[PDB]
């Protein structure tokens, strides 16, 4: 009757990526099939499942002939890691009705998921031909909702005498009564396909898809979410592992309406305000993407198997990128800060005596549940200087702004809800345009 | 000390073209990492401002006045420009383009006064 | 929503205190700029953040507000340094959506 020895007792399935090949390890192990555009792309801990709508991407589970009645009186639920593209505001408008179900027991009933619009939506399918359906109206904020490309998890608590519920991140988003049914001769074959769709470029990337052939509560679902949430690497903004040597846009956690700007050649850095865009017709809205400064991730000195995954807690450089020529970041000694513990940041300052400290270390230290990732600032002799944090001062002339910091004053307030040098990793991704 | 001058002198009629460059003098680096921004004055009356342009060129503001005047960069001197097309007489106007310096248009021009006369 | 001048009024005399006003959202609750315009050349900024002034600004001028609402004062004017203000916005691709006017006067 613990945690975890229930979560291994009641699974019944699990779709996983193990060395480019997908299989079930919940000791039924029952068919997986592929086709040869079955694609998969990077995982958090491996690779992740995509699908493409046509054809050609089907993932079915021929399931075993003992599980195959494990729907009859039982209740359940799904889990996987998700993430949608950003419906763009013309793809949306062209595609605002279509209802393609992406899970399913078609031929034909049962439990199917789908994803409509900005929704999702299970859809249960018994004999007496009654039917239930529980809506999410989407998560209006974009920035951080929850088909916004953002790596996100869904369970689908179905309980037959009882209510099903929806799960994001864990928390509750929406739900909806079931009772009031029949029994189903469910099929067994179990459809991943844009069943349906009418985009071409519609994609859905479920990874770690699994069912539990029983109910769950709010405590051991949480404990799941972290669970699947390996501290092992350290991952992006998108939810996928960071790529060494390839570009970044960064954005902090309790700033979303900033990001980030240089100043001048190789002197401070700063903050500003949001450039975004509102489509207040159709409950739209998020700040845009991918403007502000472009940034390169390296390791301090090359190796063998040099791999652009990133581990948890691995010494790295910092290069920004500009006009695609390169710099790195840093903090010169003797650097102006402010009171003498936030140290202000600097980009490559061509000193002629002056050395700098240029040697900083990814590392993950809160945020077990929301993909933020802390930069920490040592000097040449291994000492913590602190991390690049958001603390407000003017300097010289020039007007009062936000400029990035490094003070270990920070190390003292990481079991706080918000914190100042948080920060979002965002690479230039495909799902999601600037409309 | 960043003395805006600006140019491209004269009247302009109705559907023809306007230059109008933004010669930002004396920064030498000038162009690093803040935005440039346009701004319209129809004398006297309210001031909404034209669009604002990096130079990477992501795109201006586009609100409902787009597609008959378009927005240059040049790092070569820091310079950028203006470009004007398809214009009425109610435009007629001095217009603003202005180092938006770390996101406020702190200083600011002579300009030049524009006459959409016939 | 966007900008709305309440009020859009001004009567002061030289010494007094001046009283401006805005109204608008505040989806992005940030304080901003206010702009006075000398007629004899091209407008300039007057403050940022409604309580930082830049370089050679005297410090006579200040505000204050909550969310995005703001108003501001300013004491002891001089005739040499009087003309219409302007408050801003935070539009989500910002230079700041102006302020419809802010109407002033001399008192005679």
């Known amino acids: 009757e613990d945690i975890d020895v229930i979560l291994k007792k009641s699974t019944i399935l699990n779709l996983d990526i193990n060395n480019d090949i997908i299989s079930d390890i919940s000791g039924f192990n029952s068919s997986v099939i592929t086709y040869p555009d079955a694609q998969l792309v990077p995982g958090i801990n491996g690779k992740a499942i995509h699908l493409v709508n046509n054809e050609s991407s089907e993932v079915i589970v021929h399931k075993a002939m003992d599980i195959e009645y494990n729907d009859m009186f039982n209740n359940f639920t799904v889990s996987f890691w998700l993430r949608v593209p950003k419906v763009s505001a013309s793809h949306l408008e062209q595609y605002g009705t279509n209802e393609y179900s992406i899970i399913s027991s078609m031929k034909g009933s049962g439990w199917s998921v789908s994803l409509k619009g900005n929704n999702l939506i299970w859809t249960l399918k018994d004999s007496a031909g009654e039917v239930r359906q529980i809506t999410f109206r989407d998560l209006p904020d974009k920035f951080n909702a929850y088909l916004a490309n953002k790596w996100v998890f869904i369970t689908i608590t179905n309980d037959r005498l009882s209510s099903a519920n929806l799960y994001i991140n864990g928390v509750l988003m929406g739900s909806a009564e079931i009772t009031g049914l029949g029994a189903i001769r469910e099929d067994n074959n179990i459809t991943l396909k844009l069943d349906r769709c009418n985009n071409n470029n519609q994609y859905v990337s479920i990874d770690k898809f699994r069912i539990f052939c029983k109910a769950l509560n709010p405590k051991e679902i949480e404990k799941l979410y972290t669970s699947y949430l390996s501290i092992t690497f350290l991952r992006d903004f998108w939810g996928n592992p960071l790529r060494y040597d390839t570009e970044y846009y960064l954005i902090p956690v309790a700033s979303s309406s900033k990001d980030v700007q240089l100043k001048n050649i190789t002197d401070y850095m700063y903050l500003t305000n949001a450039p975004s865009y509102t489509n207040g017709k159709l409950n739209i809205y998020y700040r845009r993407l991918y403007n502000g400064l472009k940034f390169i991730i390296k390791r301090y000195t090359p190796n063998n198997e040099i791999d652009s995954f990133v581990k948890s807690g691995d010494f790295i450089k910092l290069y920004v990128s500009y006009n695609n020529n390169e710099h790195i970041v840093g903090y010169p000694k003797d650097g102006n800060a402010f009171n003498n513990l936030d140290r202000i940041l600097r980009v490559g300052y061509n000193a002629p005596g002056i050395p700098l400290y240029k040697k900083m270390e990814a590392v993950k230290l809160r945020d077990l549940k929301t993909y933020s990732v802390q930069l920490k600032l040592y000097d040449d002799k291994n000492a913590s200087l602190g991390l690049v944090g958001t603390h407000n001062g003017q300097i010289g002339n020039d007007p009062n702004r936000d400029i990035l910091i490094a003070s270990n004053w920070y190390f003292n307030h990481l079991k706080d809800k918000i914190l100042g040098c948080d920060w979002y990793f965002v690479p230039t991704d495909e799902g999601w345009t600037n409309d | 000390q960043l003395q805006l001058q600006e140019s491209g002198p004269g009247l302009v009629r109705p559907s023809e073209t306007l230059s109008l460059t933004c010669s930002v003098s004396?920064?030498?680096?000038?162009?690093?990492?803040?935005?440039w921004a346009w701004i319209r004055q129809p004398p006297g009356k309210g001031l909404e401002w034209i669009g604002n342009?990096?130079?990477?060129?992501?795109?201006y503001y586009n609100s409902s006045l787009e597609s008959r005047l378009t927005l240059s960069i040049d790092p070569s001197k820091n310079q950028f420009s203006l470009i004007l097309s398809s214009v009425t007489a109610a435009d007629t106007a001095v217009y603003y383009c202005?180092?938006?310096?770390?996101?406020?248009?702190?200083?600011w021009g002579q300009g030049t006064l524009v006459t959409v006369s016939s | 929503i966007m900008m709305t001048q309440s009020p859009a009024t001004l009567s002061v005399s030289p010494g007094e205190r001046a009283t401006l006003s805005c109204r608008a959202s505040?989806?992005?609750?940030?304080?901003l700029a206010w702009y006075q315009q000398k007629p004899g050349q091209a407008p300039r900024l007057l403050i940022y953040?409604?309580?930082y002034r830049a370089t050679g600004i005297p410090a006579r001028f200040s505000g204050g507000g909550s969310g995005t609402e703001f108003t501001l004062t300013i004491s002891s004017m001089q005739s040499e340094d009087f003309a219409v203000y302007y408050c801003?916005?935070?539009?989500?691709?910002?230079?700041?959506?102006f302020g419809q006017g802010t109407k002033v006067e001399i008192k005679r």
């Open positions: 202005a180092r938006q310096a770390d996101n406020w248009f702190d200083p």
């Open positions: 004396d920064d030498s680096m000038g162009s690093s990492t803040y935005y």
């Open positions: 342009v990096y130079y990477n060129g992501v795109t």
């Open positions: 505040q989806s992005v609750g940030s304080d």
């Open positions: 953040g409604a309580s």
């Open positions: 801003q916005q935070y539009y989500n691709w910002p230079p700041y959506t």
